[PDB]
Amino acid sequence: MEMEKEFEQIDKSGSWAAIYQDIRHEASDFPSRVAKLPKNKNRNRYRDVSPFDHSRIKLHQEDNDYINASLIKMEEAQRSYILTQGPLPNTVGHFWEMVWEQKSRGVVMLNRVMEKGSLKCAQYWPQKEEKEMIFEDTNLKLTLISEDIKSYYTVRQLELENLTTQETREILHFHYTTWPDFGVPESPASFLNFLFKVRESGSLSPEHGPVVVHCSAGIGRSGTFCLADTCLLLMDKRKDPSSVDIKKVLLEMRKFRMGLIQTADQLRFSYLAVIEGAKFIMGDSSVQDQWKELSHED
DSSP: OOHHHHHHHHHHHTOHHHHHHHHHHHOOOOOOTTTTSGGGGGGOSOTTOOOOGGGEEEOSOSSOOEEEEEEEEETTTTEEEEEEOOOOTTTHHHHHHHHHHHTBOEEEEOSOSEETTEEOSOOOSOSSTTSOEEETTTTEEEEEEEEEEOSSEEEEEEEEEETTTOOEEEEEEEEEOOOOSSSOOSOSHHHHHHHHHHHHTTTTSTTSBOEEEESSSSSSHHHHHHHHHHHHHHHHHSSOGGGOOHHHHHHHHTTTSTTOSOSHHHHHHHHHHHHHHHHHHTTOTHHHHHHHHHHTOO
16 A cells, blocks of 8 residues: 555544554564663663664673664665664763674764753763763773764764774764654654765665664664665665555564654654655655755755
């Protein structure tokens, strides 16, 4: 069923909440035993958001290999994402260790450090060139190289140094700064513009390790980003783009991390992003320029 008509069908009947609960009901449940070990309680930001054991990212250290992060492997799309929570004060070092070990080229941040008057994430990157960060527990140095601030998202160019081997790598930080505290954005143009900026950077491409995507828990906004990217890539690939079933793609992703897409509004927004993104995928290259204008990124 053409998702655009599915969308109007659901919108007219106001059944977004009902579709969403059906997804919740069907979603996978797999063990998360390592996440619940007592030695790992201070490595989880939220008691109710844990990686499954079968898809968790393991740190390459013998002491404790645990981080709250999952690998989401989309075989048909040929895309890998790492979804993770906003780092904690005590896990910032583990976060950058994961980036290094997985050979990621990009980090996608979909939250602000403070929202709704509370802290959602540690400040885990440097704010000034001359004030670098050193993570003593994992033996990494991180330097801000350049910053590129637009009205609702910022791109940063970071240098990550493994202090043991003195190897360095360029990491791109994509920070979407204008997701509202409540609800979802009214139009997705701003959403799509940012996604296609990440794509253009090479950060999602198979030459590199998986992109790291996070918000505060790593399931809501983060899920909306991965779901829209994968759906658009599948519509690009297949002979019949109309055979992209967003609900089924979401259920596949939820085999790898629980809870992806946290609200019915986020589900609705995901449909709207994919429907609008389709116009470009199907040959209207000019739509990308519009989104940039519509986004008022100056």
